[PDB]
């Protein structure tokens, strides 16, 4: 079925005047609210919300009212707060009782600065989920190019009940993955100017595991038939696979296993966990989860063999 | 603060005042100041934000005569993780010390993520004593801070000179830092350590070192509390 | 005054400047303490070289006396026979790398292979005794040579590290800090002053026209 | 590198070279070369000694030490030039029949200069 | 004939009325245009157009005009472009047919030496030749203290016809010198950090040749009998000598010689090339050319002798 059957679109452009630009997302959020009032779960994408803020700035300049920051109206924070808070899981007004939800997915756009602009500064305090761009990753053509250090999602504690019913290990695995990425990021920062000579086996494992994560879990082309849409169960399975690889290597080098030899001896397992992202989600959760269980068992037994 | 002042200085209660997200308050200040035709100040904030924060913060402390007190814990968000931003700068210039919640310490899965090194309490001496809290409190705090700093810079050097090149000071400091950030700083969100329980945990964690290596603590305290 | 990097001044460049400055400061501390450790080890190695070299004369003259005892026992000068009897290396240096203070220094170990014994079957038993004594002396000299090679490698590494640290602390930091100071104090302050002047002129004209209308 | 036995260049005293050979020494089978370079004092040319030092430390490629037996007193400039690299040869000055004072040692001189 | 017989002056001291600076520049340029109309190849010198720019700034500030970059009038760039466009070789109006020129050469005075002020940036986008000077060189008594890194001339391409007519090797030599100076600067900017060691012999030759160039060809004392005026033929000969010296040194070292031993063995040749600037232009073009041919021949023989 066409997405357009589940889609209505507002098509304001740059040629359209500033007033229409300002009112475009207001019309869009009102439509989203109307469909939420029927119990429908509505997603609203406001691309280039920074252009909306620019429309507000131009209207303010036309009115001559004194702005704040550099050029933007001071009520920018209040208006984005109201617009963002128009979203949320809600109980419909009338009867029978319903439960809709409007999810704002708004796109800011950098203007030379990444976060010093007022629109992002207000949004960070307003919005609950932030996916900040990583300019260095884009410079290296790594997609998606979001930053894993400054981006945040406060729903991680709320989703604990959802995870405990379907994927109970998801929160702790995500925490461990974030810890690995942060530790390896600080270690890369300290090693760029020194060199990898002095790093211990644990440090090398952390660096290479985080590199594997960045190159085979965070990275999605989004165009191939595989991982165009990675389902939550496939994502959880690869999370546990990568964490199993990391902690298996760490436990192996907790013994006398030199990791320089261990990497060569378990290159097969490293390639397997890297290519796990190539599983086709269309196969269904059952068989692909069986594949991931097979991969985990192979990883564990191979690391046990290589430890001795 | 009006409610807190009323309670403490008229009902003679000991009131703890907690203000959340002072950054939002500063944004509201910006919006109201720009509502009238007023020239913006540094970083857009009004030029008198110092005076307003002074008015809010000075509504605290003990006063002559009345038996009440006001303890204030304003909480604010750094817009860009920078001290130089007007809100944290003026808050530090007005208040006494500060407590730091660290981004990296939060990402490492430790709660509550208070970063001890950059956080100080400017009036900690008065809170410490014999009748006040417990006798060993200040010395234990100083020793914990010193050991944590040594563990931290030894962990930084881990990647430059290697583990084997470190002294026994640094080995015990890495062990202390791990146990510290995993058991002492790490506290359950619903876990209430009383001050004496916290001191006992700090002692059981500081008992890693022999009494010779505990330099920041006086021997009068070591002969009393080390052996338990 | 001082020096600048000739970069166009913007607040993004200011952010890059402060992050580069803090990186330079942490690198200064890191390499300074690394050089401290390397110089501690280097003082250890150089005093080791001193006493090893002063004992080298004693051990070599003891070995020479053992050789002279062998010559006295054999009567003839066995030097030519020993020189002509060399067939294969019985004593070899094991060049393997260490990790002294994070530096991949290479030392030498002794491959004493008794199976060769090419010159060990020539002459009287004094020949064998002198062979053993000279083997011990050669092991001592191999230890001294390994220590000397470590000293040379560590001297090169420490000289490079100290040169980099001093060069950075005297040029890179002492230009980045003036670069940031130039950026802020000149450009940001002057742009803010021009903005202040323009908005003050706007306020003046707005209030005077409002005053005349009122 | 290629682990090789310590070289032996002894022009101030052939007794030291003889003792080192009695310890152990190697001669190249195919190339008919030999690590030993025993030179009689007052008989081997200084240019010849420098040529041997170049052929051992600079021409031959392996991992080995190279003793000098205090004969580098005449070839001190060549010794200093060859000391610029720790490989493929590491120089040494064992005490020959004439005692080897630490003053004339290039490595000891560098250590004293760095003191 | 006295050189004043071809020179007329227009003057405003700093303390004299500020508004007259614009009149001074305009009267100077129209005098130049008038003498161009007579067929003369007049050249107009403006001592400081920055003084005119700040006079316009002060007039605007008195008028209360809205400031451009740091107080200047918004029409400053257009005014400068209109003034500068009056220069150019042209066929004068009317008959008999004659061809003139104006050749505006105007200096600007940046505040604090920073080339980012509006007056210099406006002038940079207009003039076809840029002769930026450096404070550091001028402070070390190095004159004309021109910054070869930033200074440029867009007339190099159009002047190739005259060069081929008169000095065909002039462009090749000037590009050779420019590349030598750029290479020396890029080596210098790393050698202050990594030290003089670990530098190839060719790199050392480039550094020494270019420091010789900076000291003894780019430098021109002016206040001396020999460097007051360097005729075009003498400048071409000196570039030929310097470039030939660099080529001979590079070839000799590339043929087996080492630079350190070679430099002392040919130091007299370097000193002769150094003192080549002392040749008196009044001695005649033929005599100076004979001296330069002798210098080149002696240098070539000496470099052959050191080659052995």
mmCIF file of C-alpha atoms in Angstrom, chain E residues 36-249:
data_model
loop_
_atom_site.group_PDB
_atom_site.id
_atom_site.type_symbol
_atom_site.label_atom_id
_atom_site.label_comp_id
_atom_site.label_asym_id
_atom_site.label_seq_id
_atom_site.Cartn_x
_atom_site.Cartn_y
_atom_site.Cartn_z
ATOM 1 C CA UNK E 36 47.370 60.705 -20.790
ATOM 2 C CA UNK E 37 45.220 62.576 -23.310
ATOM 3 C CA UNK E 38 48.444 64.154 -24.616
ATOM 4 C CA UNK E 39 49.997 60.748 -25.316
ATOM 5 C CA UNK E 40 52.286 60.806 -22.280
ATOM 6 C CA UNK E 41 52.613 57.553 -20.336
ATOM 7 C CA UNK E 42 51.898 59.328 -17.069
ATOM 8 C CA UNK E 43 51.996 57.434 -13.771
ATOM 9 C CA UNK E 44 50.022 58.691 -10.775
ATOM 10 C CA UNK E 45 51.176 58.028 -7.210
ATOM 11 C CA UNK E 46 48.732 58.270 -4.311
ATOM 12 C CA UNK E 47 50.716 58.359 -1.078
ATOM 13 C CA UNK E 48 47.916 56.868 1.028
ATOM 14 C CA UNK E 49 44.402 56.108 -0.167
ATOM 15 C CA UNK E 50 43.648 54.897 3.363
ATOM 16 C CA UNK E 51 43.784 58.550 4.411
ATOM 17 C CA UNK E 52 41.112 59.275 1.800
ATOM 18 C CA UNK E 53 39.086 56.320 3.072
ATOM 19 C CA UNK E 54 39.159 57.541 6.670
ATOM 20 C CA UNK E 55 38.423 61.105 5.550
ATOM 21 C CA UNK E 56 35.294 59.703 3.907
ATOM 22 C CA UNK E 57 34.641 57.799 7.136
ATOM 23 C CA UNK E 58 34.865 60.996 9.184
ATOM 24 C CA UNK E 59 32.584 62.862 6.773
ATOM 25 C CA UNK E 60 30.056 60.027 7.037
ATOM 26 C CA UNK E 61 30.304 59.969 10.829
ATOM 27 C CA UNK E 62 29.643 63.700 10.956
ATOM 28 C CA UNK E 63 26.688 63.198 8.602
ATOM 29 C CA UNK E 64 25.408 60.375 10.805
ATOM 30 C CA UNK E 65 25.394 57.833 7.975
ATOM 31 C CA UNK E 66 24.964 54.161 8.797
ATOM 32 C CA UNK E 67 28.462 52.672 9.173
ATOM 33 C CA UNK E 68 29.907 49.886 7.070
ATOM 34 C CA UNK E 69 32.801 47.712 8.318
ATOM 35 C CA UNK E 70 34.258 49.608 11.305
ATOM 36 C CA UNK E 71 32.692 52.961 10.563
ATOM 37 C CA UNK E 72 33.526 53.378 6.882
ATOM 38 C CA UNK E 73 30.854 54.535 4.423
ATOM 39 C CA UNK E 74 29.010 51.806 2.560
ATOM 40 C CA UNK E 75 30.009 53.368 -0.782
ATOM 41 C CA UNK E 76 33.750 53.169 -0.062
ATOM 42 C CA UNK E 77 34.322 50.127 -2.263
ATOM 43 C CA UNK E 78 32.346 51.578 -5.160
ATOM 44 C CA UNK E 79 34.158 54.905 -4.805
ATOM 45 C CA UNK E 80 37.541 53.168 -4.868
ATOM 46 C CA UNK E 81 36.555 51.060 -7.882
ATOM 47 C CA UNK E 82 35.354 54.113 -9.803
ATOM 48 C CA UNK E 83 38.562 55.977 -8.972
ATOM 49 C CA UNK E 84 40.820 53.053 -9.900
ATOM 50 C CA UNK E 85 39.042 52.277 -13.174
ATOM 51 C CA UNK E 86 40.278 55.591 -14.605
ATOM 52 C CA UNK E 87 43.722 54.009 -15.056
ATOM 53 C CA UNK E 88 44.649 52.209 -18.242
ATOM 54 C CA UNK E 89 46.530 52.445 -21.509
ATOM 55 C CA UNK E 90 44.097 54.057 -23.918
ATOM 56 C CA UNK E 91 43.770 55.833 -27.248
ATOM 57 C CA UNK E 92 43.220 59.501 -26.471
ATOM 58 C CA UNK E 93 40.141 61.304 -27.739
ATOM 59 C CA UNK E 94 40.426 63.240 -30.983
ATOM 60 C CA UNK E 95 43.210 63.481 -33.531
ATOM 61 C CA UNK E 96 46.136 63.088 -34.118
ATOM 62 C CA UNK E 97 45.926 59.518 -32.855
ATOM 63 C CA UNK E 98 48.001 58.925 -29.731
ATOM 64 C CA UNK E 99 48.135 56.299 -26.993
ATOM 65 C CA UNK E 100 48.496 57.244 -23.340
ATOM 66 C CA UNK E 101 48.437 55.588 -19.928
ATOM 67 C CA UNK E 102 47.619 56.486 -16.336
ATOM 68 C CA UNK E 103 49.144 53.699 -14.218
ATOM 69 C CA UNK E 104 47.658 54.379 -10.790
ATOM 70 C CA UNK E 105 49.930 53.173 -7.984
ATOM 71 C CA UNK E 106 48.360 53.884 -4.596
ATOM 72 C CA UNK E 107 49.413 52.794 -1.123
ATOM 73 C CA UNK E 108 47.058 51.883 1.708
ATOM 74 C CA UNK E 109 47.709 52.037 5.450
ATOM 75 C CA UNK E 110 46.000 49.202 7.338
ATOM 76 C CA UNK E 111 45.325 49.931 10.999
ATOM 77 C CA UNK E 112 47.713 47.803 13.034
ATOM 78 C CA UNK E 113 49.056 46.122 9.898
ATOM 79 C CA UNK E 114 46.055 43.791 9.624
ATOM 80 C CA UNK E 115 45.094 43.358 5.959
ATOM 81 C CA UNK E 116 41.484 42.469 6.902
ATOM 82 C CA UNK E 117 40.199 46.050 7.121
ATOM 83 C CA UNK E 118 37.599 47.164 4.551
ATOM 84 C CA UNK E 119 39.896 49.589 2.716
ATOM 85 C CA UNK E 120 42.562 47.010 1.841
ATOM 86 C CA UNK E 121 40.044 44.272 1.023
ATOM 87 C CA UNK E 122 38.134 46.669 -1.225
ATOM 88 C CA UNK E 123 41.373 47.754 -2.896
ATOM 89 C CA UNK E 124 42.573 44.154 -3.270
ATOM 90 C CA UNK E 125 39.584 43.151 -5.382
ATOM 91 C CA UNK E 126 40.186 46.102 -7.710
ATOM 92 C CA UNK E 127 43.920 46.422 -8.364
ATOM 93 C CA UNK E 128 45.593 43.948 -10.705
ATOM 94 C CA UNK E 129 48.893 44.143 -8.775
ATOM 95 C CA UNK E 130 49.312 43.568 -5.039
ATOM 96 C CA UNK E 131 52.521 44.625 -3.298
ATOM 97 C CA UNK E 132 51.806 43.767 0.334
ATOM 98 C CA UNK E 133 54.604 44.641 2.750
ATOM 99 C CA UNK E 134 55.610 42.869 5.956
ATOM 100 C CA UNK E 135 56.274 44.571 9.283
ATOM 101 C CA UNK E 136 58.673 41.852 10.448
ATOM 102 C CA UNK E 137 61.024 42.240 7.475
ATOM 103 C CA UNK E 138 60.945 46.038 7.656
ATOM 104 C CA UNK E 139 61.731 45.925 11.379
ATOM 105 C CA UNK E 140 64.895 43.924 10.618
ATOM 106 C CA UNK E 141 66.057 46.608 8.141
ATOM 107 C CA UNK E 142 65.082 44.345 5.240
ATOM 108 C CA UNK E 143 63.643 46.516 2.472
ATOM 109 C CA UNK E 144 61.484 46.827 0.328
ATOM 110 C CA UNK E 145 60.161 44.293 2.891
ATOM 111 C CA UNK E 146 57.623 43.004 0.371
ATOM 112 C CA UNK E 147 55.859 39.773 1.334
ATOM 113 C CA UNK E 148 56.461 37.469 -1.627
ATOM 114 C CA UNK E 149 54.054 34.905 -0.154
ATOM 115 C CA UNK E 150 50.953 37.100 -0.440
ATOM 116 C CA UNK E 151 51.957 39.672 -3.049
ATOM 117 C CA UNK E 152 50.996 38.896 -6.637
ATOM 118 C CA UNK E 153 50.732 40.449 -10.086
ATOM 119 C CA UNK E 154 48.083 39.533 -12.639
ATOM 120 C CA UNK E 155 50.088 41.273 -15.387
ATOM 121 C CA UNK E 156 52.647 38.460 -15.616
ATOM 122 C CA UNK E 157 50.658 36.728 -18.361
ATOM 123 C CA UNK E 158 50.032 39.833 -20.477
ATOM 124 C CA UNK E 159 53.680 40.894 -20.152
ATOM 125 C CA UNK E 160 54.968 37.671 -21.730
ATOM 126 C CA UNK E 161 54.859 39.386 -25.129
ATOM 127 C CA UNK E 162 57.254 42.111 -23.992
ATOM 128 C CA UNK E 163 59.414 39.512 -22.256
ATOM 129 C CA UNK E 164 59.719 37.364 -25.384
ATOM 130 C CA UNK E 165 60.501 40.541 -27.325
ATOM 131 C CA UNK E 166 63.285 41.636 -24.952
ATOM 132 C CA UNK E 167 64.211 39.062 -22.259
ATOM 133 C CA UNK E 168 62.686 35.719 -23.286
ATOM 134 C CA UNK E 169 63.964 33.824 -20.231
ATOM 135 C CA UNK E 170 62.570 36.413 -17.789
ATOM 136 C CA UNK E 171 59.269 34.584 -17.050
ATOM 137 C CA UNK E 172 60.970 31.203 -16.664
ATOM 138 C CA UNK E 173 63.498 32.699 -14.255
ATOM 139 C CA UNK E 174 60.857 34.519 -12.209
ATOM 140 C CA UNK E 175 58.754 31.364 -11.829
ATOM 141 C CA UNK E 176 61.919 29.484 -10.849
ATOM 142 C CA UNK E 177 62.646 32.070 -8.154
ATOM 143 C CA UNK E 178 59.039 32.051 -6.944
ATOM 144 C CA UNK E 179 59.044 28.270 -6.587
ATOM 145 C CA UNK E 180 62.436 28.355 -4.840
ATOM 146 C CA UNK E 181 61.181 30.929 -2.340
ATOM 147 C CA UNK E 182 57.955 29.008 -1.706
ATOM 148 C CA UNK E 183 59.885 25.770 -1.166
ATOM 149 C CA UNK E 184 62.288 27.501 1.207
ATOM 150 C CA UNK E 185 59.421 28.987 3.211
ATOM 151 C CA UNK E 186 57.692 25.615 3.512
ATOM 152 C CA UNK E 187 60.946 23.996 4.669
ATOM 153 C CA UNK E 188 61.666 26.850 7.085
ATOM 154 C CA UNK E 189 58.220 26.678 8.711
ATOM 155 C CA UNK E 190 58.900 23.069 9.725
ATOM 156 C CA UNK E 191 62.634 23.332 10.422
ATOM 157 C CA UNK E 192 62.129 25.744 13.284
ATOM 158 C CA UNK E 193 60.300 22.805 14.915
ATOM 159 C CA UNK E 194 62.081 19.612 13.822
ATOM 160 C CA UNK E 195 65.569 21.146 13.816
ATOM 161 C CA UNK E 196 68.110 21.553 11.045
ATOM 162 C CA UNK E 197 69.022 17.853 11.163
ATOM 163 C CA UNK E 198 67.337 15.182 9.026
ATOM 164 C CA UNK E 199 67.344 17.602 6.083
ATOM 165 C CA UNK E 200 68.305 16.445 2.606
ATOM 166 C CA UNK E 201 71.199 18.078 0.782
ATOM 167 C CA UNK E 202 68.847 19.375 -1.917
ATOM 168 C CA UNK E 203 66.631 20.893 0.780
ATOM 169 C CA UNK E 204 69.650 22.593 2.352
ATOM 170 C CA UNK E 205 70.677 23.928 -1.066
ATOM 171 C CA UNK E 206 67.176 25.321 -1.567
ATOM 172 C CA UNK E 207 67.233 26.951 1.872
ATOM 173 C CA UNK E 208 70.676 28.492 1.368
ATOM 174 C CA UNK E 209 69.969 29.701 -2.172
ATOM 175 C CA UNK E 210 66.691 31.278 -1.110
ATOM 176 C CA UNK E 211 68.152 32.974 1.959
ATOM 177 C CA UNK E 212 70.860 34.325 -0.346
ATOM 178 C CA UNK E 213 68.062 35.536 -2.627
ATOM 179 C CA UNK E 214 66.199 37.214 0.233
ATOM 180 C CA UNK E 215 69.338 38.913 1.535
ATOM 181 C CA UNK E 216 70.919 40.037 -1.728
ATOM 182 C CA UNK E 217 68.398 40.160 -4.604
ATOM 183 C CA UNK E 218 65.024 41.015 -3.072
ATOM 184 C CA UNK E 219 66.751 43.461 -0.736
ATOM 185 C CA UNK E 220 67.512 46.765 -2.445
ATOM 186 C CA UNK E 221 68.961 49.468 -0.218
ATOM 187 C CA UNK E 222 67.661 52.321 -2.366
ATOM 188 C CA UNK E 223 69.638 54.850 -0.321
ATOM 189 C CA UNK E 224 72.868 53.884 -2.070
ATOM 190 C CA UNK E 225 74.626 54.545 -5.353
ATOM 191 C CA UNK E 226 74.168 50.948 -6.537
ATOM 192 C CA UNK E 227 70.645 49.980 -5.396
ATOM 193 C CA UNK E 228 68.937 53.335 -5.979
ATOM 194 C CA UNK E 229 67.686 52.070 -9.352
ATOM 195 C CA UNK E 230 68.146 48.576 -10.765
ATOM 196 C CA UNK E 231 67.561 48.618 -14.541
ATOM 197 C CA UNK E 232 65.556 45.822 -16.110
ATOM 198 C CA UNK E 233 68.564 44.218 -17.809
ATOM 199 C CA UNK E 234 70.552 44.126 -14.564
ATOM 200 C CA UNK E 235 67.613 42.562 -12.702
ATOM 201 C CA UNK E 236 67.256 39.935 -15.435
ATOM 202 C CA UNK E 237 70.985 39.231 -15.241
ATOM 203 C CA UNK E 238 70.853 38.896 -11.454
ATOM 204 C CA UNK E 239 67.962 36.436 -11.635
ATOM 205 C CA UNK E 240 69.920 34.500 -14.246
ATOM 206 C CA UNK E 241 72.971 34.423 -11.975
ATOM 207 C CA UNK E 242 71.029 33.356 -8.873
ATOM 208 C CA UNK E 243 69.028 30.683 -10.714
ATOM 209 C CA UNK E 244 72.166 29.380 -12.409
ATOM 210 C CA UNK E 245 73.904 29.216 -9.022
ATOM 211 C CA UNK E 246 71.015 27.204 -7.599
ATOM 212 C CA UNK E 247 70.994 24.898 -10.626
ATOM 213 C CA UNK E 248 74.759 24.353 -10.501
ATOM 214 C CA UNK E 249 74.685 23.588 -6.775
#
